[PDB]
Subunit: 461 residues, 4 copies
């Protein structure tokens, strides 16, 4: 069918203008001030912005981790993303040594198939870069459409890879046109500190932060950057949380190296003091890299404003406070690491970022949608509002005041780390490929509506 | 009338897509794959890109300088810009101490009125920030629509202002919402070096470079940046030519200061060796800051690619080689400083930048058009292709090979500093507010078609 | 006299050992563990260090400044220096435009003649680098023995010079073998901020600090550095007070530029909160650059420890609280700027530096004596304990705990800014050229004992 | 014996003066211009400097490495050191996983026993920081007198340790008062590049350099620095060869971190073009990190001049060209790595450093002797000329012009990498603890004269 969205203000990464948008089937087919569309359903967007749907490049739905499994699966997690104004996600497909990459990819398709309500791609974890793995990456990149590869530099004995793996992966990625993502903390420094903490009887949630100091994130960021330059490759640093890491990324980019950075709402608006909340409440805020001294936030906002960081992802990795986070009572090393971030990413960036003059409204689109599509090979199918693009559009009311709460969220988790936060901005309706997923804050989509996105090889934005 | 541009590929700072564009009168009114426009003139754009018209924020048409007057006036200079794919310019209105700002503004309107073939704004030179000047700036910014103020830190005893002027101007600009531009070289260091050179009998064109070392540009860049931070203001450094200056701008932006930078085609593709050309030919390349050791070029390209510099202007400031540049035979200090750059800016950036993978095609639009409109208060009227924007559009054929030459250029000057340069890309047709200025490489516009643009107060991009 | 100093521990910039020191006349002639000297007066130094006498390169004795004259003259100031373990000073000879350099220097000789109790050199202020001055500097360096030239970048309309003067002074100084010293704050920024504070009714002492932000010191430090590199000269930055400036000096020195830095005890141990003391008590702490946020102190200590700053001077510039500082009641711009620092320089560096592990004992001697002599052309005559040195020697008891007080100090001023500070270390006896000046904490010297030192041209240490 | 060294000029890290030196037994007992010593042997030092004997903190005598053993043992190597003006060495005791530290140390004592001609200390290699090793380090430091621990970050499968070992060593070293030394190149990057070169048929000596780019040294220098700050420890970076590494050390030191750097004569005066010499001659210059582009040399010289690097060691690790270096004909990875550098360290630093104005004469002594003693816990026994020091003294004639040649050197190796280099400066006589080792350029010492030095725990210089 045709849909004619009228009387709204389109805002993209470049443009801001009043016009109507005509959708035919899955795609935008016209934009204009006087289209006189026949036989289209009229959607009234008076008082709204039309935004390109957010694309969250950093999700962990139905992920085995921390001795348990994340509490949103592909159905609940994508539904919560859609309520939060996000229309595509790119989730991390994890691998184990000795298992083929393709088997892990099949496992991830089976997590999503028939369950996702909006569109999804996958990244692929590389645990080690043995010759068989390196050979396998060719069809992964070219045929499976997975063109970003994740290397974890922390989580020793669980996800951690070493310098040989990371350097080989960067060399191979350059050959194949893949982007290499890193989780950049020094896992060996962290392993020693956490063990020392526990030996001293320091077991409360706050020691999750103290045992991962920012210098450890800075060091691993710099190491990944050096190996990227030595490979002439392209690097994407996920969840940059601190000024130490920002400085290193800024220096690398001034040298003209192809180094990109992401940050996340939790590092913008939350700080290390949240982990001190008594009665185990601090465990709600345990995720890695840890929350930082509050002064780091403004350095992150500056880096987004001045183009040193290019994207915002959620690192959505939810565990209930009851039962799951409680695995870590008495031992912070056993608290499953991760927060429930997918749903509030867009609104927090608008309300704390745009409305406070930290970034522009056009930058907000670039960082939440367009630059993410471009770095992850989904542009221009996704990430904009333009003729020929999938009709993945959010009707957003910037005037609504509301309080973020577990009482009104849609993530399948028993708390919200932004509980009580006042924001402006409300996601009213959400289209995915021209079909409504959310309409007037009610879910009208369905399990399995979402489709897998085969992503293109890397091109610089 | 209506014009329906069909079968082309639209490229803007964000988007790239195949669709038709419908113009009605001065403005774009629809974009779409199947518009079925009635009663419109069909323009066939098969095999072309549709680009937003270039906006050159750095021109000096009919400028008194160097003991003479620049050789393009508002008619020839705007016609040459249009042939070169540039549809708007922002020219420097010069002032003298003791003269009202408003009198200089009237003088500049009289240079342009009835003569410009495409649209124009003005910046305003501040020579000194006495209380009367500071009072006058209020109606300049709010009523005359001149929202960028230029301070020259070099050209002692001609254009040069001091730290008191620059700091006061930055404070006042922050109050009024103006952007402060600087020409950043240390004029006192330069004055001493040029005098020493001449005392030693060093009079050839090459000593124009030797007497303005990059450290002098670095120093003044850093000084303007510090005073901007101390004022909490916003700074635009014009013609950044060297790595010393790039490093300082990159450090300032990592601190989250509102510091922006421009570079120019001459600093990207030409180097200090051009000034050594014998038989006085070196005088063709005398402009300030001088051409640099060639290694600086890649640092400039890196800075554009990674968002540390945001715009490219020409610093079009032409003087004939015969007669005018010859004022400096025997004394390089009397060679009128400036090059003929307006016409080749867009094609050089495409051919040396996009085609060689130094910047993306979307970045090329951002740096030549969209980011310039945004920093100079002309967006979204100018700088994009979108519903409601002025129909200022270039039909650009990226496949054409040609040689840049004085034999085929349109600038009213007897040489081209890019003589013999091979490029790809040809500007085929150029619309300004929906009327053709150039059509199939022939001039079909007219003197006085162009209109003055009253620019908005500063907003961060 | 022969004097034989027995049973003490010699400490120099390199060496720490137990041995006896034989003085014959004005000079050390032997050092050894069993000298069996005859016809020598035995001085028992049991439990003492023998230190080379402090050399204070930064004094302002009998200076016309701030609408009055500093309250120590050459007699009372050199007596207070000696009681503080300092045996040589280098004082700033001021000039004014149009005045012959030689007449200024004659004035300063008359201030010191028959009055100085210990030895003294002069720096020479340069207010203006006109051709006549540049010619006269040949004799200043080669007849008068003045090989350091001071340029003030602040104090507009009083002491301030511009970049023309600074750059020409640096070029001339390189020719002559002179060191250029700078007071590096941006005078034009400060002039505007101070006038704005007053106009806003912000007249209290604290606004002395707020109108001279650290970025104004960093900017001018950077500008003097760039001009020094442009001249291939040598620079000495007096009173570095803040991390902004240290960072710039560290960067210059990594490039191999000949840039040296000084700091002062007030910037190591006092902070901006002192200026907030009510009832005009904050006027006691008014000197420039101003006291800084306390975090800056450890950056300065780091820079001394790691060789980025090489010296400690006092900037002794004393004004009584009663009468003199009160010139600025109701208007902080009229508080004469300067602290009474000469007497406590050595003890503060030992007690807050050495004893706290911030610098070593040998570094203590280097920064207070040896490296001062080397940078200001007084070595090896002054600045060490070695055969052939002048016998300028302090017997220092490091075990004595005491308070600093106006009650026990010898500066001719009615307060001490370190009032109530607990320290270790006591200056017991002081020799200047083999003669006692202080013996067992009583004055035994004489007005006029001190000699003018003609200093050598610059050599890197 | 009493020896009375007359009419020479003493030079230390602080002092330069004319005086006589009296030695009684092993120690300096007096210094003075008229000592009238009796029953002393008169040594005429007219026209000589008296220097404190060089202390070479970086030797590999009788080392099993590279499929063979270095060609100087403790006798021939210490004899060559003495002829080069070096009177103490600190050699690297190697360990292997599972081996007791005390057994390794016993092995090294047996290498030196009855063989060393001058005094020697040992560093200890740490291959693995398992709990047993960390416990054994208590006695290594507090019984064996070994207070510097070496961690190799390259030489995979041979000497390399990982970040777990490095970080735990740094924490343990801080507890114990030990200095941690690092060979900082990224071993995993190097392993991959070396294998890739071979697979591509790039087997010549030059590929030794191309497979260890400077960024791999910068990365590992940065990583050791970050781990040191994380442990609040003290680090000494051996053989800094390139600007990338210097920049990182300069940055660490400006933060106040206790990070020290060493460089070596080969990196000051040889460059990467040496490895291109044909007919396998480039194998002569194969050592790691590799020779660098020549521009790096002046950055190193700058860093010594301005105190960013504090020492010069040799990395003496000699292999004959015939037989030993030839192990790597057809495969540069099998050329045993190391140069014959011990003998020429002092003269090269004097002739290319002091005489050319790159460092001062007093800095020369500091970096070759005094600051080495201080960092490695041998001061004041060693490293200076002062009452109570060991009488380790070099008579040095600075006026002698000569060539360096295998024909006249004393290292037990068939080539000298400085063959044909013109220098000034000749080592005439050398005293170790008051006894001649070299006298008028002939060997007069004896195998076993040298003593093991138990070194003190770390104190900042
Ligand atoms: Zn992660
Ligand atoms: Zn994650
Ligand atoms: Zn200019
Ligand atoms: Zn210009
Ligand atoms: Zn001053
Ligand atoms: Zn002063
Ligand atoms: Zn090594
Ligand atoms: Zn070695």
């Amino acid at each position: 069918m045709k849909k004619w969205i009228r009387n709204g203000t389109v805002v993209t990464a470049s443009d801001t203008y009043q016009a109507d948008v005509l959708i035919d089937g899955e795609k935008v087919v016209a934009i204009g001030s006087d289209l006189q569309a026949t036989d289209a359903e009229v959607i009234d967007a008076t008082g709204y912005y039309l935004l390109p749907g957010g694309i969250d490049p950093h999700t962990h739905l139905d992920m085995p981790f921390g001795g348990t499994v994340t509490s949103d699966n592909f159905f609940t997690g994508t539904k919560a993303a859609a309520f939060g104004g996000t229309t595509s996600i790119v989730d991390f497909c994890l691998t184990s040594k000795g298992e083929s990459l393709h088997s892990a990819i099949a496992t991830w398709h089976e997590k999503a198939r028939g369950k996702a309500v909006i569109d999804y791609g996958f990244h692929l974890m590389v645990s080690d870069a043995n010759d068989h793995v390196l050979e396998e990456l060719e069809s992964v990149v070219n045929n499976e459409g997975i063109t970003s590869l994740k290397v974890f530099m922390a989580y020793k004995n669980v996800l951690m890879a070493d310098d040989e793996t990371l350097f080989k992966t960067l060399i191979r990625a350059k050959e194949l046109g893949a982007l290499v993502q890193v989780h950049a903390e020094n896992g060996d420094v962290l392993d020693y500190l956490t063990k020392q903490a526990l030996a001293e009887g320091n077991t409360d949630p706050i020691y999750h932060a103290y045992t991962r100091p920012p210098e450890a994130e800075g060091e691993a960021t710099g190491r990944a950057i050096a190996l990227t330059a030595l490979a002439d490759a392209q690097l994407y640093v996920v969840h940059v949380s601190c000024a130490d890491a920002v400085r290193r990324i800024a220096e690398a980019r001034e040298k003209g190296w192809n180094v990109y950075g992401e940050t996340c709402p939790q590092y913008l608006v939350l700080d290390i003091t949240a982990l001190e909340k008594p009665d185990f409440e601090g465990a709600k805020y345990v995720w890695s890299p840890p929350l930082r001294e509050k002064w780091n936030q403004d350095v992150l906002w500056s880096a987004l404003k001045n183009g040193i960081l290019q994207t915002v992802g959620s690192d959505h990795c939810p565990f209930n406070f009851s039962g799951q986070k409680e695995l870590g009572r008495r031992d912070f090393t056993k608290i499953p690491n991760g927060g429930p971030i997918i749903e509030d990413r867009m609104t927090i960036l608008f309300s704390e970022g745009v409305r406070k003059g930290k970034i522009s409204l056009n930058q907000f689109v670039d960082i939440t949608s367009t630059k993410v599509a471009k770095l992850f090979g989904m542009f221009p199918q996704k990430g904009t509002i333009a003729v020929g693009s999938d009709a993945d559009i959010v009707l957003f009311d910037p005037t609504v005041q509301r309080t973020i709460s577990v009482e009104t969220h849609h993530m399948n988790v028993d708390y919200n780390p932004f509980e009580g936060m006042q924001v402006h901005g409300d996601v009213i309706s959400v289209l995915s490929r021209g079909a409504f997923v959310v309409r007037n804050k009610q879910f009208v989509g369905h399990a399995g509506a979402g489709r897998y996105v085969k992503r293109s090889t890397f091109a610089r934005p």
